[PDB]
Amino acid sequence: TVEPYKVNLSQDLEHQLQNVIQELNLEIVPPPEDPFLPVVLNLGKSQRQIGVVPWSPPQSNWNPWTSSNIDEGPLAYATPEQISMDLKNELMYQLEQDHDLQAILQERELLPVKKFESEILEAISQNSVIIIRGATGCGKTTQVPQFILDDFIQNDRAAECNIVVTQPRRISAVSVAERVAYERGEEPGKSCGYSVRFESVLPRPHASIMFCTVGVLLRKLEAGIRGISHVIVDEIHERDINTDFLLVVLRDVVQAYPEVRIVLMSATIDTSMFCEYFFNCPIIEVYGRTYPVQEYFLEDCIQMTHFVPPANCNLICGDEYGPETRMSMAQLNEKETPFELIEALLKYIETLNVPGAVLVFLPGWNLIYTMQKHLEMNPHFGSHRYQILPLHSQIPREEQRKVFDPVPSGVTKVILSTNIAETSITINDVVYVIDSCKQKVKLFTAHNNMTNYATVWASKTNLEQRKGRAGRVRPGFCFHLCSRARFERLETHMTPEMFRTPLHEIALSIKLLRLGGIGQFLAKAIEPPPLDAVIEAEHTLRELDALDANDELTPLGRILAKLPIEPRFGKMMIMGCIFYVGDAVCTISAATCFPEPFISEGKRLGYVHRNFAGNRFSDHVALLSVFQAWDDARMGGEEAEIRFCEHKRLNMATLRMTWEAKVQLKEILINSGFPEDCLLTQVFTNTGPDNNLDVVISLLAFGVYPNVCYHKEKRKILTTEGRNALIHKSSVNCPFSSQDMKYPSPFFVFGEKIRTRAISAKGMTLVTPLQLLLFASKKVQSDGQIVLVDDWIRLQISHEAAACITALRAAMEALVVEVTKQPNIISQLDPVNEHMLNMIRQISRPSAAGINLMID
């Protein structure tokens, strides 16, 4: 129930728009005769239709990690025998001389998996595929790759060994590589290395192990699996979607190329499904010292602590529990975690007088931080008695290492962890587990473009796994914070990611690797995705013109497939290159893969952070401005950079990683034939007239579509669906206090539409109505005076302007198509296209929509 917004467009500009449309002979939909018969302004707009990824074994003059020949140095002509012997002698000498390494090796030899060394190696040698199955903490991840390598080293065949190990997490690929390297008396870069999105330390070319994320490996596979003897797929039980996807690829590989070795490694689950998939391959069981764990539930926890709090399975409770327990539990909301009970449980654990670390499973960083703050508010849980350590993805690896370290006696180590500590890493000296019984999952619904970082129930399997983390040292205890009635209503297994994740990126991968049809290939998965997700992916890619009508990969699609970024941002980056603002658009795109550099602590931004925004009412401009300032401060060396980040309360690691990501995105564009000149760093002002920045904001609107909203008053905004929503507290556009903001336009585009208790728009950038029509709208209807954008908002603007702007969008799309066929035309672009681009440049300006940002 909102009146149409009145767009102040001058006669001069309206005529200029018409002239450009006329000069380029672009089709325009004429005005309607009857005002109750509205006309759609939206203008309309090949190759020939199961491949297998090739494999080849290691050879001496090939570097499989850089995917290039070894020409220079002695390794170009050296025989395998020479290489093998030199490495064997090097290693033998190291073991003789290094006492600290001897001690480290002695620890290795006591790991449960050590017993099974000969059996594993035997199995792998005799079979194209095996499964290694055993409890978490046995040493599958860290030892099995070493066992394989050392077997080849010690039998004079070091040169014939190159191992890829996939991990479902970035943090695991890096951390395992550093752990294994340490276990071999090295830094990463010698026998071990890693490769994640936008960061790698490559190992030596021979007798080497590479730990990587699945996405990294897949992007490399368009040239085949070249010079690799073993592919180890780790933690298959997590049902990471990219892992599931890779298993499909590998099954075809191993059938056509049975000399390759595949090793799938799994926790204690039913692996029948995987076994049958890979031609009833062997299962090698691994086990060690298991202690019994006494498990408790919310009833038990409340009773032994005497805790009293300030569909619903907390209303159900057995008769064998007392009336106050029933009463207490019946007050607890299941959607929350009882923080005060966890506090109470920690105190109860002290009275047992058996020392040991406590591991607390919490869904995400929010509840870890909430729990951590809660404890440090009580002096009881101070340095003298307690060492409370967070464990999640985004803490520095320095802090992550501290969870393994021992504490001075009398101090209790408490680890507030995500599910990383469920099956991927094992914290030693754990005797007590407190389990939220929750998981954190990212749900996305395409229809409304809604993101939900949802707190959901864990599975019975998860609870069993979490319970087992208390029983590696001595008889332990596990405090589940769900009712005994709730437990019964838990699913046995989590929904695999394949069932609940968008597939457009996997779809591009399928096409880049020439594996055939998208639906056809995914139908062969171990558990295929639902039909609707496939249709949504196909639709998404057709809309982008990544696929043609025949669903074959266009030049545009090929580029998007090579960019490790959301395809739509990939397209935004291409458009950025065309407008010669490639660097800024690569920066926006890179930043989506990392947390916010602003250390805001979940509060409203302060003065310093807000100032980066200038007068643009834009979180994206703020981001770009911190990168400009940060890069300037780096001129004066590391300490100047450190002090800048500390003074401005910025995460320096985030900035550095984002920068490196940007560099690589540029690299891929360069190699795709885009000119260097369209990707240069360009100084900008965030206060004064800046047409480069105007255009970036226009392209951002395209990037984040369909996320556009309309400001009503205060924090309340209207979404594409017509629903009410809030400006996120972290935005520069969120009012610091009670003083209202005077936006010169009510329209904003934003990065994420998030569902919690309300609908939130996060990462918000003001745009003009002209930018809305140009890049933030698919469907536009006009009655001659009023225009209806995607059936949610109305503009009072001339028919002709709206129609011309719609044609600009169409013309821009056509140019993008041409540019992807031949990217070098960017630098030598004909006048007719420059005319079209210049018109977009003009309507990107605030002044085009009657706005002057320098005047309040």
Q: Which of residues 101-140 bind Mg ion (CB under 5 A)?
A: 140
Mark 310-349 with x for binding to ligand GDP (rule: CB under 6 A) and - for no binding: ----------------------------------------
For the record, the structure tokens of 126 come out as 């005799």
Looking up tokens 């190696």 gives: 121
According to the binding rule CB under 6 A, does residue 142 interact with ligand GDP? yes
Per the CB < 8 A criterion, the answer to whether 516 and 510 are in contact is yes
Smallest separation (angstroms) from Mg ion to the CB of 173 = 12
Which one, 143 or 191, has the nearer CB to ligand GDP? 143
Q: Which residue, 159 or 173, has its beta carbon nearer to Mg ion? A: 173
Minimum distance of ligand GDP from residue 499's CB (angstroms): 26
Instruction: Please report whether residue 466 would count as binding ligand GDP according to CB under 6 A.
Output: no
Give yes or no for residue 439 binding ligand GDP (CB under 6 A): no
What is the distance, to the nearest Å, from the Cα of residue 451 to the centroid of all Cα atoms in its chain? 13
Choose the contact partner of 453 out of Mg ion, ligand GDP, none; CB within 5 to 8 A by kind: none
Distance CA 631, CA 645 (A): 11
Residue range at the interface with ligand GDP (CB under 6 A); choices 7-15, 133-141, 211-219, 487-495: 133-141
142 interface partner picked from Mg ion, ligand GDP, none, CB below 5 to 8 A per type: ligand GDP
Encoded tokens for 444: 């996305």
Question: Both tokens of residue 123?
Answer: 């199995």
Strands 780-782 and 759-766: unpaired
C-alpha 157/C-alpha 412 separation (Å) is 48
Closest-CA residue to 162 (of 81, 67, 227): 227
Question: Which of residues 108 and 558 has its CB atom nearest to ligand GDP in the complex?
Answer: 108
- Interface pick for ligand GDP out of 7, 26, 129, 138 (rule CB under 6 A): 138
Q: 406-439: string of b/e by CB count within 10 Å (b at 16+)?
A: ebeeeebbbbbbbbbbbbbbbbeebbbbbbbbbb
Nearer residue to ligand GDP within complex by CB, 396 or 831: 396
Is 145 a binding residue for ligand GDP by CB under 6 A? The answer is: no
Residue with tokens 């019946």: 330
Cβ(209)–Cβ(191) below 8 Å: yes
The span from the first CA to the last CA of the chain, in angstroms, equals 28
- Total binding residues toward Mg ion, as defined by CB under 5 A: 2
Stretch that binds ligand GDP, among 140-148, 648-656, 666-674, 687-695 (CB under 6 A): 140-148
Nearest to 687 by CA among 751, 604, 617: 617
Q: Give the shortest CB-180-to-ligand GDP separation in angstroms.
A: 9
Query: Torsion over CA of 481, 486, 488 and 491, rounded to 10 degrees?
Result: -90
Residue 138 touches which of Mg ion, ligand GDP, none (Cβ within 5-8 Å per kind): ligand GDP
Residue 261 token pair? 């070795």
- Which of ligand GDP, Mg ion, none does residue 137 bind to, with CB < 5 to 8 Å depending on kind? ligand GDP
Indicate which of ligand GDP, Mg ion, none lies near residue 179 (CB less than 5 to 8 Å, by partner kind).
ligand GDP
In the bound state with Mg ion, the residue whose beta carbon lies nearer, of 141 and 462, is 141
Span from 134-142, 320-328, 450-458, 739-747 in contact with ligand GDP (CB under 6 A): 134-142
Neighbours of 481 (CB within 10 A): 24
185 lies in the site for ligand GDP, by CB under 6 A? no
Name the nearest CA neighbour of 580 among 666, 670, 660, 682.
682
- Token digits of residue 21: 């449309």
The residue among 402 and 562 lying less far from ligand GDP, judged by its C-beta, is: 402
Q: Pattern 185-214, binding to Mg ion, x per CB under 5 A? A: ------------------------------
Angle between helices 567-578 and 504-512 (to 10 degrees): 70
Contact 629, 644 (CB under 8 A): yes
Tell me the number of residues near ligand GDP by CB under 6 A: 13
Q: Between the CA of residue 645 and those of 355, 588, 659, 813, what are the distances in Å? A: 40, 19, 15, 40
Length of the chain: 856
Please report which helix (H) or strand (E) contains residue 435, including its range.
strand 430-435
User: What is the Cβ-side half-sphere exposure of residue 171, based on CA atoms within 13 angstroms?
Assistant: 18
Q: Do 840 and 698 form a contact (C-beta atoms < 8 A)?
A: yes
Identify which range of 78-86, 135-143, 307-315, 681-689 contacts ligand GDP by CB under 6 A.
135-143
Closest distance of CB 292 from Mg ion, Å = 23
Query: With respect to ligand GDP, which residue has the nearer C-beta, 421 or 754?
Result: 421
State whether residue 136 is helix, strand or coil. Answer: coil
Site for ligand GDP in 252-291 (CB under 6 A): none
Considering the complex, what minimum distance in angstroms separates the CB of residue 176 from Mg ion? 8
Which alpha helices (H) appear in 52-115, and where do they start and end?
80-97, 99-108
Stretch that binds ligand GDP, among 131-139, 190-198, 208-216, 708-716 (CB under 6 A): 131-139
243 near ligand GDP, rule: CB under 6 A: no
CB 65 within 8 A of CB 205: yes
141 binds Mg ion (CB under 5 A): yes
Q: Which is nearer to Mg ion, 120 or 848 (CB)?
A: 120
Residue from the set 133, 169, 170, 179 that interacts with ligand GDP by CB under 6 A:
179
**Residue number with CB closer to ligand GDP (471 or 557):** 471
State the Cα–Cα distance between residues 291 and 296, nearest whole angstrom.
16
Query: Cβ closer to ligand GDP: 390 or 576?
Result: 390
Rounded to an integer, what distance in angstroms lies between the CA atom of residue 798 and that of residue 804? 10
Beta strand 724-727 pairing with 759-766: parallel
Burial of 536 (0-12, 13-18, 19+ CB in 10 A): middle
Residue 846 contact among Mg ion, ligand GDP, none, beta carbon within 5 to 8 Å by kind: none
Q: Which of 88, 133, 140, 239 binds ligand GDP (CB under 6 A)?
A: 140
Binding region for Mg ion (CB under 5 A) out of 120-128, 141-149, 468-476, 762-770: 141-149
Q: Which of 58, 64, 137, 168 binds ligand GDP (CB under 6 A)?
A: 137
Residues from 419 through 438 that contact ligand GDP (CB under 6 A): 426, 428
139 near ligand GDP, rule: CB under 6 A? yes
In this structure, what DSSP letter does residue 376 have?
A: H
141 binds ligand GDP (CB under 6 A): yes
Residue 94: name its binding partner from Mg ion, ligand GDP, none (Cβ under 5 to 8 Å by kind). Answer: none
* Residues at the site binding Mg ion, with contacts judged by CB under 5 A: 140-141
* Residues at the site binding ligand GDP, with contacts judged by CB under 6 A: 111, 136-143, 179, 404, 426, 428
